[PDB]
Amino acid sequence: MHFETTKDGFTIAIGNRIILSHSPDKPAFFAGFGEERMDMYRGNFDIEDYVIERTALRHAEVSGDSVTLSSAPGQAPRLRLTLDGNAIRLTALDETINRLWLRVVAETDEHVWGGGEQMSYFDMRGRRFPLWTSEPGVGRDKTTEITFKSDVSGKAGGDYYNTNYPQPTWLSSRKYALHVETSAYSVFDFRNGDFHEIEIWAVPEKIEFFAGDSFADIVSALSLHFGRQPELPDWVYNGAIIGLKDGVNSFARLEKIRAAGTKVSGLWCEDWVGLRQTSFGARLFWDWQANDTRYPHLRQKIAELADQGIRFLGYVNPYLCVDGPLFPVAESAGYFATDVDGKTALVDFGEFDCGVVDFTNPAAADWFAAAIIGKNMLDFGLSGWMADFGEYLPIDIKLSNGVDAKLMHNAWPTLWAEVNAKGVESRGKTGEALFFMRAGFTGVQAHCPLIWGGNQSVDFSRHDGLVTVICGALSSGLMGNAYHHSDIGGYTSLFGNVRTAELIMRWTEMAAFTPVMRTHEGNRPRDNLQIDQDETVLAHFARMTAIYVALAPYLKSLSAEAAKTGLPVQRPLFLHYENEPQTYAVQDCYLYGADMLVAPVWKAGETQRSLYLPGHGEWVHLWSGKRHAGGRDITVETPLGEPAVFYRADSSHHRLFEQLR
């Protein structure tokens, strides 16, 4: 990075690219003080700042590699910048600053991607994105009835920026990435043509920069910095993970699914710990051991399924319910986050109370890894699980390490990911055991082998349906999470919103061209269509699993590529077509590796799909063999069973693709 003087002040650049521009009249930094409200209701945050001071740091004193910044000439310095390689280090000289604003130079036509896993907008330009892990919202669009009803009944509607996995990292179309090293609340403000504004409710230790001649190279460098995932385990390629939460009846339903020719890698029973009925629906009993009442011979059933080549997966989250036998064990060992009066802090998760296992206490972290992940899950015979939640830390609780909950809230998913990874490592099962997370922050990449898109509504809505999965895959992919998947058919059934046959089949069509096909009965299983309950849906499902298994050699090559280069399995078109401006904001299509293009149908009643075909080569339609020229919009027939999928005519895997026809 190059410091350079100008007429009125200075610039900081990486290569040809000016990043920071300071002058008294156009300052780069503003500093001040706020009093926030962050009220939590069931993982939804009502956040409002009261800004008491915001003051431009107009005056810069340069002393070599250090810049000292003050409000005005003669006034006491408030902030120090140090250029240290690819990083701007920041030191608060005024202890009272808890609000910092930083402007980075922007061009009018610049795109910015990342922000963690964004569900609504892939290109974030033109909008503001707070970065605070939470419930992402049901509906997530104030103009829909579902969002309105979620807001009225539970403050649960959310909005376009809410995510289980925020990250204060962006990739710019100017070919640099920026990372802020903080766990504090922060906002990316992309509303202004001439600058991006970062708000941080802290002075971060540093801001780190990555540059390169291609987007691919910057993503490689980001994945190396956050850490890469192991290759997918070989057993995943055997077919779909069937999600059932029907107790002993799960096994009879698995048999019916297999009898239709379905390729099955795994049975995933999140109710392995038993059910809890609430007004939300069929929830789980949060006590992390096999429930002999619900699954009386589970250890034997796991060994029986293993002899048929089918793994078994469960469910765990980092909270313990008050009415479970593990709660008093953990409370006696002092493993819970505490309230102001030193008592176990109880959080309302929705008509039941749970303690938060305090992962800042190393003994609590070690216990959860060894006793629950190790003994109760891996030694019991689980090959994997949903590793759920991580986003419910309220800011009014006290943690063993003495760090404010305001700073630990965003750190929680990364701590939770590490507990899972340590338990896996302790059994030598890294790269074989498959846990998947919906929550995240900086560093989850190093610990979690597979992200899932959390809870979608059971619909085709713009802001909470099928299409939001693709946005989540593309964003989280640029942040160095190579492997993304979703619940086939979505999760959230509320206010009479229920699945259709068409929704399940369209969702299956996308999932077959992702790393993992997994189903989910959802929050209200008996109110919603399941893959086994309609002959047409089941036959469609079986066929798509056969297509997934036939594509295994191609997916295995993409997983190898992800381990060697960091590039995600689901790629935005601009990553391989930099000179084509039409590819830069596309968020409902992805490149499945370099060689396939996928354009999922995300609306009810569509028989056709229009998409931009990139490049100067030919693309082959997977189902017909018909060739199409790159560099134009095209329309193809997409009846049920035949998603808009194309491969490069020059693909080394052409013989494999020709077979899936």
Ligand X SMILES: O=S(=O)(O)C[C@H]1O[C@H](OC[C@H](O)CO)[C@H](O)[C@@H](O)[C@@H]1O
- Sites of contact with a second copy (CB under 8 A): 30, 32, 50-56, 71-72, 74-75, 142-143, 145, 148, 151-152, 191
Side-chain half-sphere CA neighbours of 172 within 13 A:
25
- Exactly one of 117, 123, 135, 464 binds ligand X (CB under 6 A); which one? 135
Over the window 334 to 373, marking each residue x when it contacts ligand X by CB under 6 A and - when it does not, the resulting string is: ----------------------------------------
Q: Total number of residues binding ligand X (CB under 6 A)?
A: 10
Q: Residue 456 touches which of a second copy, ligand X, none (CB < 5 to 8 A by kind)?
A: none
- Exactly one of 147, 238, 455, 475 binds ligand X (CB under 6 A); which one? 455
Considering beta carbons, is residue 129 or 349 the nearer one to ligand X? 349
Contact of 452 with 511, CB cutoff 8 Å? no
Over the window 243 to 272, marking each residue x when it contacts ligand X by CB under 6 A and - when it does not, the resulting string is: ---------------------------x--
Considering beta carbons, is residue 109 or 145 the nearer one to a second copy? 145
Strand partners, 609: 636
What would you measure as the largest C-alpha separation in the chain, in angstroms? 81
Side-chain half-sphere CA neighbours of 178 within 13 A:
26
Burial class (CB in 10 A: 0-12, 13-18, 19+), 255: exposed
Least gap, CB of 143 to a second copy (angstroms):
5
631: number of Cβ within 10 Å: 13
598: number of Cβ within 10 Å: 22
- Exactly one of 171, 284, 537, 589 binds ligand X (CB under 6 A); which one? 284
Region of residue 364 (phi > 0: left; psi between -120 and 50: alpha; otherwise: beta): alpha
Which amino acid makes up residue 521? E
Considering beta carbons, is residue 488 or 601 the nearer one to ligand X? 488
Least gap, CB of 142 to a second copy (angstroms):
7
Strand partners, 635: 610
Q: Residue 32 touches which of a second copy, ligand X, none (CB < 5 to 8 A by kind)?
A: a second copy
484-513 positions binding ligand X, by CB under 6 A: 491
Least gap, CB of 55 to a second copy (angstroms):
5
Q: Is 125 in the site for ligand X (CB under 6 A)?
A: no
Least gap, CB of 51 to a second copy (angstroms):
6
Considering beta carbons, is residue 56 or 302 the nearer one to a second copy? 56
Going by C-alpha positions, the residue among 317, 436, 422, 455 that lies closest to residue 383 is 436
Considering beta carbons, is residue 314 or 449 the nearer one to ligand X? 314
- Exactly one of 27, 454, 465, 566 binds ligand X (CB under 6 A); which one? 454
407: number of Cβ within 10 Å: 17
Q: Residue 52 touches which of a second copy, ligand X, none (CB < 5 to 8 A by kind)?
A: a second copy
Residue-wise over 511-532: b if at least 16 C-beta within 10 A, else e?
Answer: bbbbbbbbbbbbbbbeebbbbb
CA distances from 449 to 133, 261, 327, 371, 452 (A): 19, 29, 28, 21, 10
626-655 positions binding ligand X, by CB under 6 A: none
Residues found near ligand X in the complex (CB under 6 A): 135, 270, 283-284, 388, 438, 454-455, 491, 520
